[PDB]
Amino acid sequence: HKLLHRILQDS
Amino acid sequence: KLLHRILQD
Amino acid sequence: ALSLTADQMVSALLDAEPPILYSEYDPTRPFSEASMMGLLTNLADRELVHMINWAKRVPGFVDLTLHDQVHLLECAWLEILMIGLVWRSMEHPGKLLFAPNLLLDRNQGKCVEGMVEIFDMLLATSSRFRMMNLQGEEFVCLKSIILLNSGVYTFKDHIHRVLDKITDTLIHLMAKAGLTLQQQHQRLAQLLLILSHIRHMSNKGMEHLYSMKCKNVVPLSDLLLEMLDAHR
Amino acid sequence: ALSLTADQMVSALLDAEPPILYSEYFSEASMMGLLTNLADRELVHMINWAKRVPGFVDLTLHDQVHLLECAWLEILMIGLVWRSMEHPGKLLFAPNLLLDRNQGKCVEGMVEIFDMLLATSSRFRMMNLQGEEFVCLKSIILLNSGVYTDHIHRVLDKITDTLIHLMAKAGLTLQQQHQRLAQLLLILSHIRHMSNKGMEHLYSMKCKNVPLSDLLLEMLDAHR
Ligand SMILES: C[C@]12CC[C@@H]3c4ccc(O)cc4CC[C@H]3[C@@H]1CC[C@@H]2O
Ligand SMILES: C[C@]12CC[C@@H]3c4ccc(O)cc4CC[C@H]3[C@@H]1CC[C@@H]2O
Ligand SMILES: [Cl-]
C-alpha cells in the first residue's frame, strides 16, 4: 500500500 | 552564542 | 458532521488548526538552489504530518474510507500548504513567511530555477487576501473546502453535504460581521474564485517539484515522493 | 506583568503554549537520533514560549539566555511528563513516538531516566494535575532554575498567587491549598534532579559521538 494509507491509521 | 540570536530575530 | 451548528463548525475548525512550524534555515551560508529546495521540502514534509492529523478533525473526513481519505489528501496537500503560506504571509507585504525564521522576497525566490513565477503568484494571492481583509474564521473554512473539494471529481453526496454546511458557515460569519445580504454573496463568490487560483498555483508547484526531483536537486521523503507520484 | 489578574495570568500562559511536535514515523544511535532531533526542534518553540511568559522579555538578553540555558531540559521533561499523564507506563515523546519503559533499554543508561520520568507522570496522574496548574509550574521552572546563578521574585510570587487561585476556585480548603502547593513544588525538585541526570547522559552521548545540532550543543555546553 501507500505510506499514507498506513500513516492515516496511526493515532 | 546562537541562542543569543533567536532571542532577537 | 451534518448536525453541527455554524458556530460549532467554526469552533471545531479553529480548535483543529495545526501549529506554525520552523524551518532549519542556516544563516551562516548563502542560498543555493539545492539548499533552498532542501529547506522548503524539509518544511513541507513536517507540515504534511500535521496536515494529515488536521484532516482527521475536519467534520466528515474520518467518515470516509481510508482510500477516499488518501485520495483527498493526495489531491489537496499542496493547495493546503500554499493557502496556509499565503495566510501566514498576509501581514508581510512583498514577502512569503514560509516559517517565522524563513521570510523570503521574490528576489530570493530567484536562486531556484522556475521558482520566482510561483513566488509571484503566491505573493499576489497574499495581497488579495490582505486587500479583502480575510478573517481567520473564513480562512479555516476555505482550507476545509479545499480538502473536501479538490479531489471529489476524481474519486460522494456525503462530502457535498458537508461542503454545503461549510457554505452556510461562511455566510453566517459574514452576516455576523455585519455584511449586507448582497455583500454576503459577493464576498462568498470572491473567496471561492480565489480557490481556482490556488488550484492553478498547486499545479505549477507540482510540475516544479517534479522537475526538481527529476534533476536530482533534492532528495524527497517517501511521503513527498508518493504525494508527487499520485499526480504523475 | 504584575498587574494582571490570576485569570489573566492563566489565560496568558495557556495562550503561550508551544505545539506538540512529531517524530519521524531501534538501535542506540537511532533512538538517540529521534529523541535529539525532536528536542532540538522543540527548543526553537520553547524560546518563543519563554518570551510570552509574563516578565521574561523585561529581563536583559543576558539573563534571558541564562534562564533558558539552565531551564531547557527541565522544561522539555515536564512537557513530556504532562503529555504522558494519560498513558501509564509510557512516554509520549510525540503522538507518533510513544515509548514503553522497555524501549528505554535500547540506549545505555536511559532506562533509569525513563523510570524517573514515568514516576513523575504517575505522580501527576494521582494528583490529578490540571492543565492550568501545569503551565504555572512550567513558568516557575523557567524563572526559578537559574535565579541563583527582585522583579523575578515578584513574578514568582504572582504565579504562586495564581496557583493558589486555581486551587481555591476548585473548592480546596485552605489547608488543602497549602498542601497541594507544597506537593507540586516538591516535584520540581525531582524534575531538577532528572534534568541533571539527563544532562550528564546527553554529554556522554556527545562524547561517544549521534550528531547534535549547534543549538543543542551550546545548551549542553553551558552546563559544562
Ligand atoms: C513545492 C515547492 C517547495 C515547497 C513549497 C512550500 C513549502 C512549505 C509550505 O508551507 C508551503 C510551500 C508552498 C510552495 C512550495 C513550492 C512550490 C514549488 C516548490 O517545489
Ligand atoms: C536528553 C535526552 C534525550 C532527549 C530527551 C527528550 C527529548 C524530547 C522531549 O520532548 C523530552 C525529552 C526528555 C528526555 C530527554 C533525554 C534525557 C537524556 C537523553 O540524552
Ligand atoms: Cl517540527
Q: Which residues contact C58 (CB under 8 A, 6 or more apart)?
A: C13, C16, C144, C147, C148
C-alpha cell at A8: 492515516
CA D76 to chain centre: 4
| Helix%, strand%, coil% for chain C, nearest 5 | 70, 5, 30
Phi, psi of A7 (to 5 degrees): -50, -35
Q: Which secondary structure element, helix H or strand E, spans residue C97, and what is its range? A: strand C96-99
SS3 state at C96: strand
SS3 state at D82: helix
For chain C, the chains sharing at least 3 beta-carbon pairs closer than 8 angstroms are A, D
Phi, psi of C22 (to 5 degrees): -100, 150
Q: Which residues contact D22 (CB under 8 A, 6 or more apart)?
A: C46, C49, C50, D94, D95, D96, D97
The angle at the Cα of C224, spanning C138 to C79, to the nearest 5 degrees, equals 20
Distance, in Å, from the CA atom of D77 to the CA atom of D224, rounded to the nearest integer, reads 20
Distance, in Å, from the CA atom of D63 to the CA atom of D10, rounded to the nearest integer, reads 24
In chain D the beta strands, taken as DSSP E runs, fall at 90-94, 97-100
Other CB atoms within a 10 A radius of the CB of residue C18 amount to: 17
Q: Which secondary structure element, helix H or strand E, spans residue D43, and what is its range? A: helix D28-50
Judged on CB neighbours under 10 Å (0-12, 13-18, 19+), D141 is buried
Q: Which residues contact C186 (CB under 8 A, 6 or more apart)?
A: none
C-alpha cell at D24: 519521524
CB contact under 8 A, C52 and A3: no
In chain D, what residues touch C46 (CB-CB under 8 Å)?
Answer: 22
- Measured CA distances, C177 to C11, C97, C138, D16, D190 (Å): 16, 28, 11, 27, 51
For chain D, the chains sharing at least 3 beta-carbon pairs closer than 8 angstroms are A, B, C
In this complex, does chain B touch chain A, defined as having at least 3 beta-carbon pairs under 8 Å apart? no
Longest dimension (CA), chain A: 18
In chain B, what residues touch D68 (CB-CB under 8 Å)?
Answer: 3
CB contact under 8 A, C101 and D44: yes
Distance, in Å, from the CA atom of C48 to the CA atom of C56, rounded to the nearest integer, reads 13
The angle at the Cα of D37, spanning C54 to D46, to the nearest 5 degrees, equals 70
| Helix%, strand%, coil% for chain D, nearest 5 | 70, 5, 25
Chain C residue with Cα closest to D95? C53
Atom 5, ligand 1: residue with shortest CA distance: C40
Query: Ligand 2 centroid vs D111 CA: distance in angstroms?
Result: 12
CB contact under 8 A, D44 and C50: no
Give the CATH H-level superfamily of domain C1-232.
Answer: Retinoid X Receptor (1.10.565.10)
Q: Which residues contact D8 (CB under 8 A, 6 or more apart)?
A: none
C-alpha cell at D124: 501527576
Of D51, D7, D9, nearest to D154 by C-alpha is: D9
- Residue C69 touches partner A, C-beta closer than 8 Å: yes
Q: Report the gap between the CA of B5 and the closest CA in chain D (Å).
A: 10
Residue D83 among known ligand-binding residues: yes
Pick the CATH number of D1-224 from 2.20.25.90, 3.30.750.24, 1.20.120.160, 1.10.565.10: 1.10.565.10
Q: Which residues contact B2 (CB under 8 A, 6 or more apart)?
A: D214, D215, D218
